[PDB]
Design a protein around this ligand. Structure first.
Ligand SMILES: *[B]([O])([O])[C]([C]C1=[C][C]=[C]C(C([O])=O)=C1[O])[N]C([C])=O
Length: 263
């Protein structure tokens, strides 16, 4: 809805930064609405969904186990390791790691998982194989959140990320069981409260993943819909603002409010 585009532009004005936006029909893959769909934005922690996706494909293929336990040490600990830092002694399973990386945005959990699949280059190659020739992971946590202007490293495009997420959630790429596992993690998200979630009406379905970074970067990817089921993919990225975290949260939630309102 064009009225949503009005809010998006309003957001750019409010934040004094670029905003990338996309609304995608889950079933058909049709673009319902877009704003700078083909400009690059830093993915930040939104990439964690893609990471667990690659992990799940490995599991499906017998190359990995959800139950496998990983034993890391204090040396692996990076800033923003709310969960990992609590299990230093016993380690954590692949399952718990994906859960932490997604539901809590745990940075260490991501690096550990990155290691198991062969690093950024491997994640990148996974994406490329599934038809996404744009999205790219170049660094590890937490350097990937650098967001230097004009840098292509660790970026995606709103259209690329939307279509990729769609393939992941509804394609033949993952077994049905893995798909669900993926959705289950996004659904249990615990740090995205002040974003789309704040405008969501009761009884609606939401599976999402947020992210933040330097240079006022903030973003969210999500599958949502009325009646406990998703029917649309929404991707929102911003970068360059000198605004506070709170002001960035508000604009995102206001965009959400508009999209819901004009559903
Ligand atoms: B992520 O954006 O790569 C990473 C970890 C992260 C920490 C706190 C809150 C969020 C969010 O809103 O989802 C995160 O993603 N960001 C940094 C700066 O390390």
């Amino acid at each position: 809805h064009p009225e949503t585009l009005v809010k998006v532009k309003d957001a750019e004005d409010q934040l004094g930064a670029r905003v990338g936006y996309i609304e995608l029909d889950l079933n058909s893959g049709k673009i319902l609405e877009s704003f700078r769909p083909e400009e690059r934005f830093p993915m930040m922690s939104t990439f964690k969904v893609l990471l667990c996706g690659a992990v799940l494909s490995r599991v499906d293929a017998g190359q990995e186990q959800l139950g496998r336990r990983i034993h890391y040490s204090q040396n692996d600990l990076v800033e923003y390791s709310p969960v990992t830092e609590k299990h230093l002694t016993d380690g954590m399973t692949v399952r718990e790691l994906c859960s932490a990386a997604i539901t809590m945005s745990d940075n260490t959990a991501a690096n550990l998982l990155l290691t198991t699949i062969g690093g950024p280059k491997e994640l990148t190659a996974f994406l490329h194989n599934m038809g996404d020739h744009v999205t790219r992971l170049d660094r590890w946590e937490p350097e990937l959140n650098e967001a230097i202007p004009n840098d292509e490293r660790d970026t995606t495009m709103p259209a690329a990320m939307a279509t990729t997420l769609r393939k992941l959630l509804t394609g033949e790429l993952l077994t049905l069981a893995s798909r669900q596992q993926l959705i289950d993690w996004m659904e249990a998200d615990k740090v995205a409260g002040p974003l789309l979630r704040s405008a969501l009406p009761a009884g609606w379905f939401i599976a999402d993943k947020s992210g933040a970074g330097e240079r006022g970067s903030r973003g969210i990817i999500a599958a949502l819909g009325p009646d406990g089921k998703p029917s649309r993919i929404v991707v929102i990225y911003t970068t360059g603002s000198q605004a506070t975290m709170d002001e960035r949260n508000r604009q995102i939630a206001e965009i959400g409010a508009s999209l819901i309102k004009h559903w």
